[PDB]
Symmetry: C7
Subunit: 190 residues, 7 copies
């Protein structure tokens, strides 16, 4: 009959209902934020929360995306806002990174010259950007050269594959050897 216990228990029930809606309400707020700022739109290859693919559509509660191999992934908007966004289509030009390990005894300037010839021969490589072919690091078993090449995002993978194959062919022709993991022993007969 008291008017205080009833209002207290209804307030407790209301806060419980709010805490229940918590997940869905947070996700829908995240989704409406995403749509009204549109950092990324449907149909462009991107990466969200560590998983990459083309987003088919974005919904109020979550988003639907398809990776390269055909996985259909539904990601709740809360994680998109919590996580990072890695957009690919925003920049038409990107950069490929080749790491080539060669033997210690192999000539240095010869490798740089042949790599420069290879990259200059390729036409899909953006010549305006830097053509980086430098001795990167002195590895445990082989010295590693680094190659940074800028090219359009559309033909990035094809450029990578063609450059790698040409590198293999030219290295085989020129006698430069890709070394297996080296190691040396010391015999001690007992």
């Amino acid at each position: 009959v008291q008017t205080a216990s009833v209002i207290a228990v209804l307030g407790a029930a209301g806060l419980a209902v709010g805490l229940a809606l918590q997940g869905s309400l947070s996700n829908l707020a995240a989704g409406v934020l995403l749509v009204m700022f549109r950092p990324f739109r449907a149909g462009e290859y991107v990466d969200l929360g560590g998983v990459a693919g083309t987003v088919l559509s974005v919904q109020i509660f979550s988003t639907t995306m398809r990776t390269a191999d055909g996985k259909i992934i539904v990601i709740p908007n809360g994680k998109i806002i919590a996580g990072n966004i890695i957009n690919f289509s925003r920049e038409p030009v990107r950069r490929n990174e080749f790491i080539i390990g060669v033997a210690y005894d192999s000539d240095i300037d010869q490798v740089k010259q042949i790599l420069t010839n290879i990259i200059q021969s390729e036409d899909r490589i953006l010549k305006d950007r830097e053509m980086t072919v430098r001795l990167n690091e002195l590895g445990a078993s082989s010295i590693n050269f680094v190659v940074r090449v800028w090219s359009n995002s559309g033909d990035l993978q094809n450029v990578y594959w063609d450059v790698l194959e040409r590198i293999k062919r030219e290295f085989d022709a020129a006698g430069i050897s890709f070394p297996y993991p080296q190691m040396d022993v010391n015999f001690k007969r007992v």
Copy 2:
């Protein structure tokens, strides 16, 4: 006799009861949201939060699923909406990935040609989609080729197994060798 301490303690009890219901209320809210949006329904092979299988049924509090090995798992809906969900039946066609390591001295174009012949021989491979047979990377002990092949989700595993067996047979016939991890030594008698 005071009417303020009693209402205060009843309010504290009510908020405590709400915080008690927290887990069950959140889980049931997530479950009803999933039911009323239905990213996936019962009877399709999917993966939730890292565990995969066929969902037998979905309940208000959690969901029941069977792993490929007959394992029965109940997953709370709160973690489902908090986690990532991926579906297999949504996309009828998926893509298999083969990674084949071959010795450095092995011929390059011959391997590509024989792999293309193998994939063309198979009929369950979708001809409309791409057939990527390219050099992928120069590994420490062997050069790795990548093969990306699209096929229907129903027969994906069978296509994978048959392609792998045919690859093994053809490589053995053609003399191409799968190399063991190479090592280099340098004798130093003391």
Copy 3:
């Protein structure tokens, strides 16, 4: 003498008491939810939160389980619902997974035939379900075959052990060899 500071401090004390009860109230709510939905009952092998065993009984505050080796573990219900739950007795039939590594030179179809003969010989194997014996993958030092066998949950371990022993004996008899990790070396005296 003020009637506002006193009600404020009593309200603060009440919310503090609620936040104190937080753990016990959440755990008891979780336990009552479990008992009134009974996803699992007492006396059947299960796995909660990564630790597995047979539950002796379930209480309002936590649950009591006995591990295979005899560990007595009491698990709070809150983390039981927070984490996943695995059940064994729900599905009377499960699937065993054998992975067998063999040398590259070993015959392929002979191994498949002998494995099929072995699994056919065993009677506890459920013949209605699939009996997969396929080349699974090309390992670094040995090709690994996969065997999937469906059998009743009661005799799963015994079937596994008997199949493994028979595999060992038949492989020894037939000349098939389990290869040790294979390396290859290149001598170059200095």
Copy 4:
């Protein structure tokens, strides 16, 4: 002079004081909960929150335990109730696990027979419980047998040590060899 700002600021101070007491109040609530259900008492070997030892006494704020090496550890009761806690004194009988690696060429049934003789020789081994001596797994360099033996909790360690020593002596006497990590090499003179 306003009566609303003062009550508002005192309420804010009260909730701040409650959030201050948060840790101590939660810990004492957990402690009293553990006291009045007493899943474990003082003086028996247990493992709480990943650290094992004999609990000396339990307090309202935390618990005091002594590790086997003499470390004195004080654990807050909140972490006690949060994580999994296990007891060893609850079950008078536990199970020891032996993993014995032997060479591929070693006789199978001979090892099983000698292990059965060893376990039958020991009297502290519970005869009623199972005596599992089966080929467990085919390891990379050796085949591993599993031995599961039930015995009283008090003499578990002594049984383990005596069984291990007898296993070593019997294996040395019978000619069974514990293999070192086996390696295979292939010479390539260049």
Copy 5:
């Protein structure tokens, strides 16, 4: 018709809406905080949340950064405030670290002298700062020296590459050898 249930339910709805806005409001507060303290501004190379790049622009809700390879990353301001932020352009001069591993029998003072000559030869090295060339550590297979060189941020990478190439050339000329992973063996042929 009651005036208490309606206000209670509207208060619950309002707190639910606030908990929905939670993420957006926190992120916008973080962004405005960043704007009005400007720890970093657009167009300078920075590294936040573990990802590095040039800040193309800063928005109220998030920040847009271009990675060195051309990647576009959108980072919510909540991560910037919560995580650590690192700046490059704030300090015009930085320090390059070189770790060089040599043979155990190689001369010590000769290496230090040649390294000092190398660093003195370079002009972009800031001579006012220290030029640390000391025996750092006695590694498992080689002794490692550390070189610390201070130079302007603009030419840091070029200085690093040129110094490394000159180190390689001078070491080859002087006969100092970079040792492969050493490991000796003992023969106990049965």
Copy 6:
């Protein structure tokens, strides 16, 4: 002019200020709790939060401690009461652990006898407590024996060092050999 918006906004500001003080108030509450239970007092060797050393003094907000190497660490009391604390000085006697790896062919009982003689010779070892010298584990390359020795906390490290040196000397004198990592090869000329 409204008297409701003003009280609402002042209440919001008050709860914001409470959330501001949250960390400092929690830390000071934890500190005063630790002071008034004093689980550890100033000037004793302890370990908390993964860092060990002697606490110089404890403050209301945090604590000041010095590591064995002279490091000065200030640790917030909140994380102290959140984590686990262990005290070296509480127990005057602790237990030292020795793990000794010996060859497979080495005599078993001889090693146990010589270790028992060594520990008997030492006087700082508490003879009342157990002195365990038993075979412990069958390693991949060497069998590991276990030694548990109880001694006063003051001379624990000195006892450890002296016992280790005596073990080394006695093993060298008696012909027992500490084996290098063993490994087996199988030549296969091609």
Copy 7:
């Protein structure tokens, strides 16, 4: 027109704004707390939350530090108090730790005598503090000795480097050898 819905929605907006300011207000409270206790001050080398350097200045919202190599780091104060803080400059004298691995056959007391002579010869070593030169442990491939040396914080690194170089030179002169990773083989011709 109702006076209850308006106050409810304004209260919800106020709590939303409070939760928005939450991060910045918590950080500023942490910063002012640090200032008014000044556990560390500008210009002294310290380590906060895992990143080390000299703090240039401390602000209300965060702090600015420059690492050894010149990176500019902005650390929020909330993370500062959340994590540990260690001060190098508070204690004028610290302790360097050398670990020296030597062969099993090398003399024990000779190495200790050499190390004692080396540390005694050095003058920057604090003679009042202990000079620990003891056999630390029996490594897998080499026995490791530990050397603990106390010296002023200013010349700690120089003392370390000079001691290491002198150790190398003296060990080379005395014939003591730093062993490469040992390993043993067993020939098994097939």
